[PDB]
């Protein structure tokens, strides 16, 4: 159905059914499709960006990407397998609340911070994983990319369980953009950041199905 029937079946009609038959006539008469040619302007839809391509030479090889996407899966496989074991152990580690952006930022990078141990990540629920990725994106917007961050992002990703929420899809995109952008600043291939940025772009585009963003060489 798109238009279901609710009611049944030259001088005015005295009975309803006789009316509706009569109507059924007059409209069947009528042209189902009509087109009114006319003669003589638009609003804008702020669709977001994609990902900034790599400078010539820097974009990584499909084989490598493919290898990274493969291995990551094994990680994530292992991460899943032994979640329960690491769920139960934790000497220092005052794990901030899911609400505490500023406290979760210092926790991870500090102001130095805790790395992502399985003991520490395996306790964090999906909602926290999400939030923590976000703050770490926010700390990225406003600061230099560090390997603490890279491992932290990477690890948050490994724990990120799909099917992803559309919210989490969008967050990892915004992230990868920053990577691709922060990539434009590089002056030599031997830069620490380069490969790290490339990975995080890679895993998102290929592992997390966000292919429009991917590095094609």
């Amino acid at each position: 159905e798109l238009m279901p029937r609710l009611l049944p079946v030259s001088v005015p009609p005295r009975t309803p059914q006789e009316y509706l038959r009569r109507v059924q006539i007059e409209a069947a008469q009528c042209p189902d499709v009509v087109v009114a040619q006319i003669d003589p302007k638009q609003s804008v839809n702020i669709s977001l960006s994609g990902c900034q391509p790599a400078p010539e030479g820097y974009s990584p090889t499909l084989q490598w990407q493919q290898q990274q996407v493969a291995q990551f899966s094994t990680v994530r496989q292992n991460v899943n397998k032994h979640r329960s074991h690491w769920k139960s152990q934790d000497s220092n580690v005052t794990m901030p609340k899911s609400e505490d952006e500023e406290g979760w930022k210092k926790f991870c990078l500090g102001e130095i911070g805790f790395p992502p141990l399985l003991s520490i990540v395996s306790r964090m629920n999906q909602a926290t994983v999400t939030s923590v990725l976000e703050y770490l994106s926010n700390w990225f917007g406003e600061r230099d990319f560090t390997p603490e961050l890279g491992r932290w992002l990477y690890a948050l990703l490994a724990c990120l369980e799909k099917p992803l929420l559309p919210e989490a899809h969008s967050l990892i995109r915004q992230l990868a953009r920053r990577c691709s952008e922060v990539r434009l600043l590089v002056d030599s291939k031997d830069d620490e950041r380069v490969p790290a940025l490339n990975l995080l772009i890679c895993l998102v585009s290929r592992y997390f199905d966000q292919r429009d963003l991917a590095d094609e060489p």
């Binding site: 490598w64 990680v75 790395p115 990540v121 390997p147 890279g150 491992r151 690890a155 490969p195």
Partner: peptide, 17 residues
Amino acid sequence: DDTALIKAYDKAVASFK
């Protein structure tokens, strides 16, 4: 292996060449 996530990332980064 608790630092295993760290080593993976590390391994993964060091693969780029």
